[PDB]
């Protein structure tokens, strides 16, 4: 079996991408944020505190299949400070035709203020390694851990687009979606993340510097968070650039042609086009823009978010000994 779905930016800043999922019998279609930096399938539901609800809600009582994982509960916190918890049901879930039975669907009783204000995101689909699932007392396999045994190939692919639709493939590798070949690189699961190590970086037409950079592929993260020295090296080529404490990071004139960024993958090189990095005006009408690359020093973990991921065709190979593929497009 295989599944294919379209993935859409929730705005003109690619702040995030939503992907329709069909939960329960009959189908209840929800827009979910596929988040590889985590491992939980949770959704706004009839159980969610009303006043916290502004989103398409999941009603398990309208599902014939939906069961109640008795005595089970989940709570989770994210980098941005957001959070949510509630209880768990087992129900049928289908993503781009791919149908999985008995997939644990976490029902939100409560959701932090951030989500509630997020109208376009009905919930998230965790695609990290199961060990990071928050359900208690027994953890629940992700959508991907559950589909593996029925997939043609234990791989899923994220082909995110720059200010345009992209795609999530499950079980197969579309050789038409990318160019050249795919270079695979080790993945450490010690943290339960898709954690690999980049062989280095370059700024524009400058020299590639071999320097180890341990980070994670997190589609559920908007920007590119790298060590400080690296980041600064980049903006140092950008004249109007400067670090802004009030805005919270590196800004630069919206009229500056930004240099491309290159991160090594094995002996391979993925080039992030300058344009991608020019994230967007700090506010509508401003002539000051916000950079897509920022220091990871605050998060305490290097993260290749959508600014990097969307510049390549990525392969999350869920075989016994996982690997992360990377190819240009």
């Amino acid at each position: 079996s295989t599944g294919s779905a379209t993935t859409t930016p929730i705005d003109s800043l690619d702040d995030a991408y939503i992907t329709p999922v069909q939960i329960g019998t009959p189908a209840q279609t929800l827009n979910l944020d596929f988040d590889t930096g985590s491992s939980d399938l949770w959704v706004f539901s009839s159980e969610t505190t009303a006043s916290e609800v502004x989103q398409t809600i999941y009603t398990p009582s309208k599902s014939t299949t939906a069961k109640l994982l008795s005595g089970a509960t989940w709570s989770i916190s994210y980098g941005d400070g957001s959070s949510s918890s509630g209880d768990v049901y087992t129900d049928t879930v289908s993503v781009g035709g791919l149908t999985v039975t008995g997939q644990a669907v976490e029902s939100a009783k409560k959701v932090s203020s951030s989500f509630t204000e997020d109208s376009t995101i009905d919930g998230l689909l965790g695609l990290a390694f199961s060990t990071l699932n928050t359900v208690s007392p027994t953890q629940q396999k992700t959508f991907f851990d559950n589909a593996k045994a029925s997939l043609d190939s234990p791989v899923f692919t994220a082909d995110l687009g720059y200010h345009a639709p992209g795609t999530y493939n499950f079980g197969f590798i579309d050789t038409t979606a990318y160019t050249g070949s795919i270079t695979y690189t080790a993945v450490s699961t010690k943290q339960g993340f898709w954690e690999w190590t980049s062989t280095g970086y370059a700024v524009g037409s400058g020299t590639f510097k071999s320097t180890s950079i341990d980070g994670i592929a997190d589609t559920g993260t908007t920007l590119l968070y790298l060590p400080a020295t690296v980041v600064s090296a980049y903006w140092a080529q950008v004249s109007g650039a400067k670090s802004s404490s009030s805005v919270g990071g590196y800004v630069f004139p919206c009229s500056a042609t930004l240099p491309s960024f290159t991160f090594g993958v094995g002996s391979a090189r993925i080039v992030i086009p300058g344009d991608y990095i020019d994230f967007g005006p700090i506010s509508t009408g401003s002539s000051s823009c916000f950079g897509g690359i920022q220091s990871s020093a605050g998060i305490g973990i290097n993260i290749f978010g959508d600014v990097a991921l969307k510049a390549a065709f990525v392969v999350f190979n869920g075989a016994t000994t996982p690997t992360l593929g990377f190819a240009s497009k």
Partner: peptide
């Protein structure tokens, strides 16, 4: 309007 997903 950056997004930042477990801790």
């Amino acid at each position: 309007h950056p997004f930042h997903x477990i801790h």
